[PDB]
Amino acid sequence: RDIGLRIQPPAEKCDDPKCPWHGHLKIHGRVFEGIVVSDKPRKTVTVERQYYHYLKKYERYELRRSRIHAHNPPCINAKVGDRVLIAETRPLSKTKHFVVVAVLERA
């Protein structure tokens, strides 16, 4: 099945209605890549991405990091340390607005 990403679907199926592969959730907007740095809450992960910001006065760079909370479907079940792809969705909780759609490199 395709959801417009162009990536392979997960190995097995799930019953989560909040899953974009086997449920009714839709993805639309930005797609980010990052690293998991926390997986304690049920079906929730924290994803961190690094980037450089340019300081015009000092003509030099500094490193900044972006942290995003995302929903973790049971068929994927990402864990701390691996690379993930996440896609934007409709509000799911107070802080959750993305869903994990693929593990790129297991830790």
Partner RNA sequence: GGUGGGGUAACGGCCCACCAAGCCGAAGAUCGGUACGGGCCGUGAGAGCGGGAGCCCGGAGAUGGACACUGAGACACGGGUCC
Partner RNA sequence: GAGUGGUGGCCACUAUUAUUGGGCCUAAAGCGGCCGUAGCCGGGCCCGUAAGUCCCUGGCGAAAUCCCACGGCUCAACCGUGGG
Partner RNA sequence: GGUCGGGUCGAGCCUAGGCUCCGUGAGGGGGGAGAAGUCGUAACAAGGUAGCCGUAGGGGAACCUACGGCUCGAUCACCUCCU
In the chain, the DSSP E strands lie at: 31-38, 44-55, 60-71, 83-88, 98-105
Instruction: Find which of RNA, Zn ion, another protein, none residue 14 binds, CB within 5 to 8 Å per kind.
Output: Zn ion
* Residue among 1, 6, 11, 63 that touches RNA (CB under 7 A): 63
* Residue among 5, 14, 18, 49 that touches RNA (CB under 7 A): 18
3-state class (DSSP) for residue 94: coil
Note the residues at the interface with another protein (CB under 8 A).
4-6, 27-28, 31, 52-53, 55, 58-63, 94-95
56 binds RNA (CB under 7 A): yes
User: Phi and psi (nearest 5°) for 81?
Assistant: 105, -10
Q: Which helix (H) or strand (E) holds 17?
A: none
Instruction: Find which of Zn ion, RNA, another protein, none residue 5 binds, CB within 5 to 8 Å per kind.
Output: another protein
**CA–CA distance, 93 with 70 (Å, rounded to integer):** 10
